[PDB]
Design a protein around this ligand. Structure first.
Ligand SMILES: CC(=O)NCCNC(=O)C[N+](=O)[O-]
Ligand SMILES: CC(=O)NCCNC(=O)C[N+](=O)[O-]
Lengths: 828, 828
């Protein structure tokens, strides 16, 4: 190919009885006609291809006041809609194009709405009724700096728009291009002007190449293609819908009449454009005609396609015209023709040209070697199509297009709760439809995650099959710094991490690495496979602290690595007792080796202490409990200050039972905690000095995150944190968790996530103050985690959903476009 | 320069108080304002730059019916006019562009006339009111096959049109391009829409960069430039008016408001376009602003030209805006700005920007390093200018333009006697004006001859100085096969060819070559310098036939070579007696050597015969004279049958005097011819056999033209013509000249030219039947010849006037454009 072939990487279209590409396929393939009488709500030649309506537009979506919407050419309104839908169609997130060199090239040859406005004034009229802003408004809304223009060559405007975009891309003037056109028939005055010309079929049909040929029927609509160089297309890994090899535009020059087309000029345009692409009469699979159905214009266009592509061909050449389905869209005729050919090329199937029975007696189809496509068939032999579009003032354009070279989240967002509902439902319908079933649930979710604006109102639905997700959608249609708090002893439960292991490789890999180290450490000095202990439901081994502490650490670090791989990065971390070892390690203070040495030792040295230990949760203030225990320092102390009326008392089971009895006798809650020992009491004094010797052998680095101490109840710096005195004291004195939550909030934490099993810490964080428990109980682990990272994403946290789909080899696929909240806007 | 620089090789403009480029210079240089109140004949913000009128158009010139003219957007009408004037301005003859790849690119952003039509229907409305035909109609009229489009970027449309033409030329899509725009303010509805926007100065002035800045004043008009690649420009030897180095167009992207311009986007457009041309802040001589005079838009455009061209410059940069003279032409604003800069570049002088007194307090001119041009000065240092044009919808365009790297006929033609008159007068005014005086009479005539359509009504004026030609113009404002008949004995006069020798080198050269041979031939066997004999007025030597015959031959062959060098090529030739030797030689039958040998011999062998010879011209039929001379064959015969009542009797002076007496006695004309001998009588019998021996030594080739015999009275073929019998008989028997004219006419000759001195043969050709004598008497030879070739050109003969100007080194120079016969066309 001479010059850089251009990639159609997307498209949109509003056509008669075809609100999108899918519907346009249904219509064309069913061999259906959207030509009707003029709707009663239009003014009134009595025939035409009309949109279901031209008055409705989501002005708010594009930041347009109702009064500006009223004053705006519905052509401007529609092209905005089509622009957004073309980008979404291609997979590009429009915000990423802000300040890029995106070009806008639109064929517009009519200003009907300006006629309605003028035959009946505020600052709005100027921009609303001026044709230039059909392109310019697209450019202003996307914030694009590329060239932005409307072109008027009449009934060839929309294809010439495409040509100027291809050349624009070739010259590097623009990196991406929106091209096509728009034509709305919303004034009788233009209906009467084209009627008086003599161009209109009294029967209201384009009899394209048929012998009934007696004029064209009018149609209205718009189409846009998304254009990138083929090079840049493949590089950026974008859905390639088809490729423009060569575009050309000439003029009739010296025709018989101004309005008569010239056979010479059409041959000269064909010969040139094909030679630039290097395509012979035999390599062209199908030609999408102008084919207006005019007595004069049909034979000339036939004769010209004959001479160039009829000679040098054994088979007849298939020809058709979307003007037989939707009428003559004039300025938008060519982008209509191109968008058909592009669908015929992706589907690899031809569709019928309607209104053909007997051939025109001025068009020998046999001699010229062209056959009119009359049925939906498959397309034989890559596949190559040609598109013609001619203007009455003589300016012809042709384009040569070739075919292209366990638990899932679906994320949905909108600019409005009502849009989000509508967005959810539109995806359910599509997902559960034939066309959505050529796409896997995997592929869909990946496409939802990467290729779609995350608007201000967001939901996540989850499911294991399509039926489950579609069900969740239908149901849906009816911040600060991120703080992590790592769970302590009490939060453990048999099964811990089995369901997360089977589900997520990133958890399983990290869980295997942390268990591999721990199985060596514990295997050497046991209280030997920790995974088997944790994952077995028939086992109470985890209630024994020589297993509980390494188990909580293993589950918490796996979970942290899984969260981190989804972009859920804590900035500030705190831990309840053994929680702090997981927290401190992932803040990079201890290597995995030292962390495993530290936690396993702690587990063991405490495990080997005698019975006679107890802890009780008590509904009382710190000040109350200090008064009740003053003088008993040697037998009992405060194990935890968890809330302002939430402290755990720990020590001799004798004096604990007494304390539990006292607060119950005051009509307070008092729950006996299931634990082997009196943690954070004087009963820990025996193991302390042995614990101090294990930590004195470890290497403490400065943290990569802000650590808040469960001992200090405040932000803890490295010098304190990287000493032996801290970790012995940590093992012995009260967990100041309530105070830790305060210090986190004080330092700017707005979102709190419990990193551990259950929601013990989340409850205590709630009592102290946005709190979510990463893995709440009474539901499968994958469900409870996805739920939790869901709330975070909905509240505005930038979850990296892309990274959730590293496990699978998910491919981008076309999705429904934004469910516009259209409302009526019109003159009075 | 990155991409192929483009040559502006021509331009036209209709602007307020500036009907052409010359007037636009006068206005700009006088520092004049064409802003006025709305004329009373317009509908009605109360201020504007208006054309003297927008209703008048020569529809017939462009083959448009008055009814189609009525229905036509005056924008369409004006751009047709401007198209023809742009081509004529560049020197290109529009008929030569028929079927070439000429591109038409026009900025048009308004359809006012469609508003007038619709607020009040035939087949005419469709093409007349559709914007696309502003470009397409140009394309149809010129018969051009290049791309033909209107573009709408709003108030930047006309410069973007230029850009798309430059890129079109660079890609070889078009070989020549018409680019610019048009904007006519002929509807109140658009006046009220821009008023309500808030953009309009209540004072009705663009106070460009002045502190009174309070909006723009509207203006109307159009401009076109003629564009060719610089390569093709120099090659084809075309007037280069200036050269576009680099054109760029972008869009504001994310501006504060849709309609607010962005400083960022303007910097990005400037940086790019200049870098493509390779021009530094210091190489730019002047910048032609957008400079609307808006409070918001002036500072932003200033700030952006500052940042790019203000830094890196020791001197301030001169800036101005034609919007201070003619108002804001909107869609035609940019081509207005470009056409100024192009005139500043040819004149090598700056002009003032009006309405500047005190600088805007939001525009530090010192800091930004821009000074507003306030006076007409010279332009210091080749010269380089920049043109800005911005649209309200954000689409900016900039262009970088550099400065360029004895008796005369004036030919004038028109499509109408009234146009020819008007055409003649418009050239007289211009010729005799200062601007026409920078062009020599030579240069003018060459330009008239080569660079101007030869329309169906044509005149030639002649003169020796400008005063004489301008006088001839003012006076002017108050076919078949071409046959040559070569003069015989009787037509000679003393001076013969002296005035033609001094005048035309091609005659003089050929006269010297024919005399050089003859002076040898005659010098050897004399009856010795033939030029001296012929050119002397005090000499009767030429009445002696030994001189007369070579003299007629020498003058006739020189004249034939002069005629041939002007493209006045005879297809059929005849000669009276010695005439036939010149005729036969130039038909290539005899070489110059043999022709000179033949004629000189003939001259001599006849010269040496005795006295007693006479000839008399007689007003009588051949049949009458045969009856009167029957029986006297030995003493007298018919010397010539010249007309149907015109024969010359020749022989013994005794019997001739008798014949002269007889016809006088019958009351008939009878003129005694002044001759030495009785030519074509029995008195020639003595020299015949000696004549036969000279011709028998000569080489006769087949003629390259049709020869008609004065002996045969019919078309003579080579076998007869290339024999000795023919030329002896030719010398002896009657000249059947009347019959020769008949045979010429019979074989299709419609134009007859006497090749010889005087008009003896022309009279006889008139009597027999378009007849012109190449050199009639009683007037200087150059005058009488130019007159004669004038009549031929007027009657439709393709005279090659180009070839008349090989003598001088004449250069093409700009001329007045076609004097359109404008009449009113409008709606009712
Ligand atoms: C002379 C006449 O009525 N020609 C109509 C044929 N023109 C065409 O087919 C191009 N077009 O206006 O869509
Ligand atoms: C916001 C506003 O009224 N802006 C006017 C400034 N715009 C310009 O100068 C570009 N133009 O419409 O010729």
């Amino acid at each position: 190919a001479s010059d850089e072939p251009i990639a159609v990487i997307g498209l949109s279209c509003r056509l008669p009885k075809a609100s999108g590409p899918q519907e346009l396929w249904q219509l064309l393939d069913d061999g259906a006609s959207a030509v009707t009488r003029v709707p009663a709500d239009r003014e009134t030649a009595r025939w035409g291809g009309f949109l279901d309506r031209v008055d409705t537009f989501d002005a708010g979506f594009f930041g347009i006041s109702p009064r500006e919407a009223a004053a705006m050419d519905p052509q401007q309104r529609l092209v905005l809609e089509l622009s957004w839908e073309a980008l979404e169609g291609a997979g590009l997130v429009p915000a990423t194009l802000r300040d890029t060199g995106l070009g806008v090239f639109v064929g517009a040859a009519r200003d009907d709405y300006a006629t309605l406005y003028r035959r009946r004034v505020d600052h709005h009229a100027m921009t609303g009724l001026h044709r230039s802003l059909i392109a310019n408004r697209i450019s202003y809304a996307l914030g694009a700096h590329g060239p932005s223009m409307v072109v008027d060559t009449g009934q060839s405007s929309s294809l010439v728009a495409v040509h100027l975009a291809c050349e624009s891309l070739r010259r590097g003037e623009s990196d991406i291009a929106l091209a096509g056109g728009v034509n709305l028939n919303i004034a009788a005055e233009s209906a009467r002007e084209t009627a008086a010309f003599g161009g209109l079929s009294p029967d209201g049909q384009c009899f394209t190449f048929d012998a009934r040929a007696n004029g064209f029927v009018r149609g209205e609509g718009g189409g846009l293609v998304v254009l990138k160089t083929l090079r840049r297309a493949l590089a950026d890994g974008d859905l390639v819908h088809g490729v423009i090899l060569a575009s050309a535009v000439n003029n009739d020059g010296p025709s018989d009449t101004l309005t008569t087309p010239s056979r010479r000029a059409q041959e000269s345009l064909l010969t040139r454009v094909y030679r630039r692409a290097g395509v012979t009469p035999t390599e062209v699979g199908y030609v999408e005609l102008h084919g207006t159905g005019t007595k004069v214009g049909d034979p000339i266009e036939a004769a010209a396609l004959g001479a160039v592509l009829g000679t040098g061909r054994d088979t007849p050449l298939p020809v058709g015209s979307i003007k037989t389905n939707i009428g003559h869209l004039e300025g938008a005729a060519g982008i209509a023709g191109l968008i058909k050919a592009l669908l015929q090329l992706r589907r690899r199937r031809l569709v019928p040209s309607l209104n053909f029975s007997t051939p025109n007696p001025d068009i020998p189809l046999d001699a010229l070697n062209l056959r009119v496509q009359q049925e939906s068939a498959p397309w034989a032999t890559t596949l190559v199509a040609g598109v013609s579009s001619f203007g009455m003032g003589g300016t012809n354009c042709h384009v040569v297009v070739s075919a292209a070279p366990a638990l899932l989240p679906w994320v949905v967002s909108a600019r409005s709760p009502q849009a989000l509902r509508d967005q959810a439902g539109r995806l359910a319908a599509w997902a559960d439809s034939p066309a959505g079933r050529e796409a896997s649930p995997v592929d869909i979710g990946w496409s939802l995650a990467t290729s779609r604006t995350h608007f201000e109102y967001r939901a996540v639905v989850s499911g294991s099959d399509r039926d489950e997700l579609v069900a969740s959608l239908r149901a849906l249609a009816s911040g600060g710094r991120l703080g992590l708090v790592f769970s302590g002893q009490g939060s453990q439960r048999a099964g811990m991490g089995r369901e997360l292991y089977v589900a997520f490789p990133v958890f399983a890999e990290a869980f295997d690495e942390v268990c591999g180290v721990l199985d060596e450490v514990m295997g050497a000095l046991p209280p030997g496979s920790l995974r088997e202990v944790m994952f077995e439901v028939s086992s109470d081994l985890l209630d024994e602290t020589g297993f509980t502490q390494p188990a909580l650490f293993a589950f918490e670090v796996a979970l942290y690595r899984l969260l981190e791989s989804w972009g859920v990065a804590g900035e500030v971390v705190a831990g309840h007792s053994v929680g702090e070892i997981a927290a401190v390690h992932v803040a990079g203070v201890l290597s995995l080796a030292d962390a495993c040495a530290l936690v396993a030792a702690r587990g063991r040295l405490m495990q080997g202490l005698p019975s006679g230990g107890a802890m009780v949760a008590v509904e009382a203030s710190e000040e109350e409990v200090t008064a009740l225990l003053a003088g008993r320092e040697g037998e009992v102390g405060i194990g935890a200050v968890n809330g302002p009326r939430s402290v755990v008392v720990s020590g001799g089971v004798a004096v604990v039972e007494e304390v539990a009895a006292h607060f119950a006798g005051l009509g307070r809650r008092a729950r006996r905690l299931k634990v082997s020992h009196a943690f954070h009491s004087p009963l820990m004094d025996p193991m302390l000095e042995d614990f101090g010797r294990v930590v004195a052998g470890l290497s403490f680095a400065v943290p990569e995150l802000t650590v808040v101490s469960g001992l200090t109840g405040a932000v803890v710096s490295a010098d304190e944190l990287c000493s032996v005195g801290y970790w012995v004291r940590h093992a012995r004195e009260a967990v100041r968790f309530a105070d830790a939550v305060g210090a986190m909030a004080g330092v700017g934490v707005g979102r709190f996530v419990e990193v551990g099993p259950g929601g013990v810490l989340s409850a205590l964080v709630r009592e102290c103050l946005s709190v979510v428990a990463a893995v709440r109980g009474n539901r499968a682990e994958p469900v409870a985690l996805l739920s939790a990272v869901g709330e975070l994403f909905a509240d505005g946290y930038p979850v990296d959903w892309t990274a959730y789909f590293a496990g699978w080899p998910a491919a981008r696929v076309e999705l429904p476009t934004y469910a516009f909240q259209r409302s009526r806007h019109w003159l009075e």
